[PDB]
Amino acid sequence: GSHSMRYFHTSVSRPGRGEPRFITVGYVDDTLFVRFDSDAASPREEPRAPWIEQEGPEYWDRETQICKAKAQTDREDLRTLLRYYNQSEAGSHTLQNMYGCDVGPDGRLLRGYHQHAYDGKDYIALNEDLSSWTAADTAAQITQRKWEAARVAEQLRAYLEGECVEWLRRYLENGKETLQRADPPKTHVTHHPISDHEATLRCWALGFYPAEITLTWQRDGEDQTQDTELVETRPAGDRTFQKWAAVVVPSGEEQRYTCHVQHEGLPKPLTLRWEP
């Protein structure tokens, strides 16, 4: 179906403890494939998925050069941002950037992204048009003016519609065993007495890829949104994800509750009940 490639970058200053630490990771869909950490003994971009390992030495050299240069511009940016916000040099601050592309089944660009946050807050984002900017505040407007003057957006658009989509197409082919395989959830319901009056029903989804999934409980056919505890989807560590949804059920009402599961690896959504 549809796919994404995204690069994430974080620099965190640490005054009095050397230069800001820079960490960048790349994903295709929910699969990590490259990483770079400036605190590594010998910082290089490193493979993290089998289908990227076949890239040759020129690829790794170029990628590493890009990551090193971005670490340095982030350090200049963190200095600039202290000026823009009138901040002292004493505290730790955070600069984050994400960029990348979403494509459809036919591989054409669906949406591109390039956006920054400072201290956990939206700072400036390339709009969906890939041609104009949304600045969160008057500091980010200073950046916007510089980026408009330098026609940054036009360069980003060229990458996002061109190289980004072409790399993603290559990776999807080289990784077709895994990137193009959905693993459906393994599902079951457990029952956990709380008191004489009620018990938890917990609906589990395990071993699924990609991470997107919908779990819901109904009672007599009515969604129980307010009364469902839904944990964040979480990594298992073997590429797959886990999730559960739980409801507190009065004694003897268990068969009125049904759990509903949607996942791209399922040809039809599932309905489950507690099976004593």
């Binding site: 974080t10 990771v25 984050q96 956990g120 964040e232 560590g237």
Partner: protein, 100 residues
Amino acid sequence: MIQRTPKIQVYSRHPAENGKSNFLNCYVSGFHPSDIEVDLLKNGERIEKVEHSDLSFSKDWSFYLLYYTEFTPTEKDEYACRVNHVTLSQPKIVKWDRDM
């Protein structure tokens, strides 16, 4: 400076079976700033050589990390994850429950 306190889930890679090797995971997510300390505990004591993922973040910019180690659950051994973050006045200990 905004702060967001971590969600914490402690859980196994597969369903727990006593005496069968597994992985113990502590997933911390939704937090800001990124500085965080995570220990995995066995019977109250820190497990050595625990590994973790590289810092990444969600669509809302909040950070997430996975800490993990091999373990072989038993009936009596107690596992937990202990997290410290600027939003916490004291370290938060979440016990492992094989039913969550």
